[PDB]
Design a protein around this ligand. Structure first.
Ligand SMILES: CC(=O)N[C@@H]1[C@@H](O)[C@@H](O)[C@@H](CO)O[C@@H]1O
Ligand SMILES: CC(=O)N[C@@H]1[C@@H](O)[C@@H](O)[C@@H](CO)O[C@@H]1O
Ligand SMILES: CC(=O)N[C@@H]1[C@@H](O)[C@@H](O)[C@@H](CO)O[C@@H]1O
Ligand SMILES: CC(=O)N[C@@H]1[C@@H](O)[C@@H](O)[C@@H](CO)O[C@@H]1O
Ligand SMILES: [Ca+2]
Ligand SMILES: [Ca+2]
Ligand SMILES: [Ca+2]
Ligand SMILES: [Ca+2]
Ligand SMILES: [Mn+2]
Ligand SMILES: [Mn+2]
Ligand SMILES: [Mn+2]
Ligand SMILES: [Mn+2]
Lengths: 233, 233, 233, 233
């Protein structure tokens, strides 16, 4: 068997075991700032991703086994105007050499063309695109910006959101939950996801986020902490 | 600091680090059978509880600190008739010397009289009593059979339910979630619970369950696995 | 499988998941004081033991498997006079209902009569009895006060000793090591121990210590911290 | 704080979270073969290293803190002739971009010139060079092929050696132990090592090994398993 685990109470300003992509950076105070902020205000047309350094062995073709994993992180999405927000933040798995994809509604995870890339993600969508449901939502996405399953999400502006995500290999069940401690409000969505068929044997895990493509659709996407463990046997 | 953790993939037929109360027993196959089964059929007027041997330090008066904990267990509730079920199963914390309370709708956790006992529990209620909401539910209960918060629960007869419960001391947030891998269906409920004011410094953690008080309101309450960790600092 | 683990950075003055036996108590500062101290000076004819509350499943007759475990603790032995010391302190496993045995050189673990009790222990002996080697030693003991294997031990008066003990089930190897960080000095002893044949399926783990039987052979036996994990599969 | 941990019961033939350097490879059976083997026989002039993918934060200049870590691995060194062996294998820490250094007696870790590189290592030396003690030894090395402290090591040809290494930041104590389960024989060495002064803030951890520079001084250097955890607070 192979177990791999890591836990940050906060992030290090120059983090060597976190690959920073796009505009992602860690603040002096140890927040993982996924999207751009200038003069303490979020900027549009921004995209940032962060991956853990060590690839995670999620399945093995030789032994035909699949990994079960669990991760918990807290994040904040703040927007100067509650009514106009975009685009969102997501936890995702992708091939180790994964690079930022389309910005805006694609969340830096997906793009177009039949050549849709291997990426499984739990997204926290704050903007209803043409492929979305009408209200803000938490979606389970499998190789597409369109969620296979989702649950309506009462986003709370600027409030800390605690997230727990677990994948049970034995039942191919991916579950994702969000709780705002502020008002003890929760949401959850689960889906049957075959990882072997959606992703390669090894993957990198992390976060991706994008601010909106207009000045009036901006917000922050900061990750405050992160714990993650995966076991393959 | 003090960390305490334990993990059973299944239970041992004669388990010395599990205190069995009432009719609770572990089957040869390693299932924690909370309620009575005779000829493979659940019997009425049954009550069983199971606690971990070692008390858990959840708060300390001297250092004024509170513990954060997390537990995951999978359970099955099977009833010969879908329409008539009772009463339920619950994960709970109570003083170390805790003993079974009222049966039936009280879930072996609570009883009557102003002398209501110290017990915090996440309950999986399958019968609507006079103090319940109308439909089956997952409730957060604080020193009362009446839930402070609850979420409607689409109970699936005989199907495995995976549960994750976490308490974040820093925000006094208790969250409880249920997912049926069978059909990737989920439910979640969270509540602000001050543990210091509801329970003593040390507690025992475990499960409690009761079958209905009539022959036509019977079901099983089996726990298949259990992991639990708590840290106090 | 079944995993069980606990970690104290220090002890709680009134510890509910530590069974205190004999004169053992935890000080206000959180030290596990195994032997008696009066006016800050160790007293003779003292014996104290401490066990973790939850029994540990070390082997299972049905599945014919044995547990692998590992524990680390730091301890101090202080004596007003370097030349005259007694008797020692030990980490040990014994049946769950284990009670203090003979004092003095028997370390509160063993006694006489063909009815020698089931107890495996790693002892830190500070007095050469008739059954001991001549110099102070770390011994692996299997159902006898006489060590099966030992290594000469350069005891450092009043200095912190860090101990790591591990049992590898697959090779029936018990290893015990001591390091004084003060002067980076180390000692180690290992032995082939069949746990199934020496102890029952379930056991309690902990510490035992005794001061000498004369006024001029006194010392303290304090445990400062303790971590312990055991897995059975 | 930041915790990082990983555990392999064995290695994966194409391991993406293990950087393989020099001649190092993983066999079909999952052994980490550090040095070359041709027709099942070890070859001379060989050097192989393996590092974990994710850098480890061992100290932080801003917060002036140091990490405590612990690792356990089992390894085998087999030589066709007991009397003539070389050179050895070592666990080591070095800057993340670390590359193989001199072969032979330098163990792929060190080389010459005042420009001696930052590398701390626990070495299992099977050949007495001009800078070594006379007999085979386990050495603690700090930025030099010459060990600061060592203990004579009774190497057992072809037998499994279990190793436990721990660094206690609070006392700057590095301890390294070896036990042969075959005959319950142990060795240990500890040293006061200031990591902040010997290595940069971030490092990569892993193994390095070299076979001798002559045909009659050859042996294997295989790692069978590996667990490692480090916490910085
Ligand atoms: C395709 C795409 O990303 N569309 C974006 C949408 O996601 C949102 O950010 C909007 C804000 O004005 O700008 C565009 O419409
Ligand atoms: C107070 C109480 O437990 N009432 C019980 C209720 O919980 C349910 O089990 C019912 C089934 O016929 O029997 C009684 O009404
Ligand atoms: C049998 C026995 O415990 N003998 C004790 C010995 O252990 C030591 O404590 C000594 C000190 O004067 O007192 C007695 O001889
Ligand atoms: C400097 C150096 O590595 N010297 C090596 C020594 O380590 C050993 O391998 C020997 C075997 O014949 O070959 C050389 O002397
Ligand atoms: Ca969207
Ligand atoms: Ca009810
Ligand atoms: Ca003695
Ligand atoms: Ca050498
Ligand atoms: Mn979406
Ligand atoms: Mn209820
Ligand atoms: Mn002895
Ligand atoms: Mn050397």
């Amino acid at each position: 068997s192979e177990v791999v685990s890591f836990s940050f109470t906060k992030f290090n300003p120059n983090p060597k075991d976190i690959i920073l992509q796009g505009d992602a950076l860690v603040t002096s105070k140890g927040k993982l700032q996924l999207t751009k902020v200038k003069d303490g205000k979020p900027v549009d047309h921004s995209l940032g991703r962060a991956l853990y350094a060590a690839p995670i062995h999620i399945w093995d073709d030789s032994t035909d086994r699949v990994a079960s994993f669990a991760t918990s992180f807290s994040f904040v999405v703040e927007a100067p105007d509650e009514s106009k927000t975009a685009d969102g933040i997501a936890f995702f798995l992708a091939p180790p050499d994964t690079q930022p994809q389309k910005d805006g509604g694609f969340l830096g995870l997906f793009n177009d063309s039949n050549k849709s890339i291997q990426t499984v993600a739990v997204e926290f969508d704050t903007f209803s695109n043409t492929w979305d449901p009408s209200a803000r939502h938490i979606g389970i996405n499998v190789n597409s910006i369109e969620s296979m399953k989702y649950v309506k999400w009462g986003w709370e502006n600027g409030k800390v959101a605690n997230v727990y995500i677990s994948y049970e290999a034995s039942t191919k069940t991916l579950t994702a939950s969000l709780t705002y401690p502020s008002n003890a409000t929760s949401y959850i969505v689960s889906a049957n996801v075959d990882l072997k068929s959606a992703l390669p044997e090894w993957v990198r895990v992390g976060f991706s986020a994008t601010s909106g493509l207009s000045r009036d659709h901006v917000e922050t996407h900061d990750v405050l902490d992160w714990s993650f463990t995966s076991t393959l046997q």
